[PDB]
């Protein structure tokens, strides 16, 4: 069963979109009511455990198609919307606890809400990934959800962050590096699901070894991305990434050893299996430092060792094959160093699904927009 660390959802101040005098005429007034309601509904859905990706997709597009009117021009004879600065938006952040941040920009709202949707996808994903039975249909769903979240994060980062007038404090979700980390964790996580599938389907060891190794590199890269932050808020997360890295380095060594065995290198294979078991033991160390490290989001546990099942199988086959050469329980002619892994994964690597916001709601007409009078 899967274990994925999760930081808490962002929270936001209620927005009524009630502008009083600024609003003149029924058209502009109804569009403000629909903004109010479509935002409220989307926010309610975040904490709803009966929410699936169909409902979230609908609610999000409804709200975003309206919100877009505060951002993009209609006739496009104007740079942007005149309402972009009308409203102050306040959001908490995944690592920052109860200390919120506020900007009066519609873009900040767009990015923050969109960031929370992606977040919601990773949570729906891990909620499902943690169930026991876990049919194949549910696995695609988890895999797909994680890739959708990736696309949203990536899109927000490249096509949106630059538009902001106010750069976010380092350590906030709207900082570029933080978003890159979320992208990479989403890919790494989707690949975990593919690794479990590859293993139950009994694919080639080299394929699984390459995928495990590439996955550990993503975690290492995500960790390197969060390295530029402050230890107080970012420490727990980074420990989890380091832990994952040990977990999947241990898998790579396990399945590499089967490769070395099939090529009749007994000493090298033995050494490589020893490394797998060592790394996994150190991974069980880092696991406790992780559970004892103060930081945002609850602590998760691996349990569930399918590793020792494979290892026991490799060991018996290796000892039967390699004894009379390297020895029975006391091993001779073993390389002093573990093999240095360079592995290319040709199968299983995950791309984020390209994402785009819906086009501005047709409910935004020049007449409606004109009924907004700022003075």
């Amino acid at each position: 069963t899967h274990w994925f660390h999760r930081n808490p959802l962002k929270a936001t101040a209620p927005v009524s979109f009630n502008y009083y005098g600024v609003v003149t005429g029924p058209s502009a007034s109804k569009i403000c009511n629909d903004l109010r309601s479509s935002r409220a509904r989307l926010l309610e859905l975040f904490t709803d455990l009966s929410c699936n990706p169909e409902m979230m997709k609908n609610a999000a597009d409804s709200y975003f198609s309206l919100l877009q009117g505060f951002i993009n021009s209609l006739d496009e004879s104007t740079q942007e919307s005149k309402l972009r600065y009308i409203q102050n938006f306040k959001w908490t952040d995944t690592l920052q606890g109860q200390v919120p941040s506020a900007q009066q920009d519609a873009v900040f709202e767009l990015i923050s809400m969109g960031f929370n949707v992606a977040l919601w996808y990773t949570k729906y994903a891990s909620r499902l990934a943690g169930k026991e039975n876990i049919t194949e249909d549910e696995a695609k769903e988890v895999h797909r959800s994680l890739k959708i979240a990736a696309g949203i994060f990536k899109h927000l980062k490249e096509s949106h962050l630059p538009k902001l007038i106010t750069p976010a404090e380092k350590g906030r979700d709207l900082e570029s590096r933080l978003i890159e980390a979320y992208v990479i964790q989403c890919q790494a996580e989707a690949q975990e699901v593919t690794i479990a599938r590859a293993i139950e389907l009994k694919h080639a060891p080299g394929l699984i070894a390459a995928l495990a190794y590439e996955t550990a590199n993503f975690y290492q890269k995500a960790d390197h991305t969060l390295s530029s932050l402050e230890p107080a808020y970012s420490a727990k997360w980074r420990k989890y990434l380091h832990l994952k890295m040990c977990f999947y380095t241990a898998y790579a060594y396990c399945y590499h050893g089967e490769t070395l065995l099939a090529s009749d290198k007994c000493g090298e294979a033995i050494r490589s299996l020893q490394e797998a078991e060592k790394l996994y033991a150190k991974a069980e160390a880092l696991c406790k430092e992780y559970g004892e490290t103060k930081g945002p989001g609850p602590t998760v546990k691996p349990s569930g060792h399918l590793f020792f099942r494979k290892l026991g199988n490799l060991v018996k086959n290796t000892l039967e094959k390699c004894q009379r050469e390297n020895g029975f329980i006391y091993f001779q002619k073993i390389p002093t160093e573990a093999p240095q892994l360079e592995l290319k994964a040709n199968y299983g690597l995950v791309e984020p699904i390209p994402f785009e916001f819906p086009p501005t709601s047709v409910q935004w007409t020049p007449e409606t927009l004109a009924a907004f009078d700022l003075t």
């Binding site: 593919t194 389907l201 995950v350």
Partner: peptide, 17 residues
């Protein structure tokens, strides 16, 4: 679905066998 080398692949990107 096939990859660039013409290998049949599944939903998860693994070789379809």
């Amino acid at each position: 679905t096939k990859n660039k080398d013409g290998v049949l692949v599944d939903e998860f990107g693994l070789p379809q066998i």
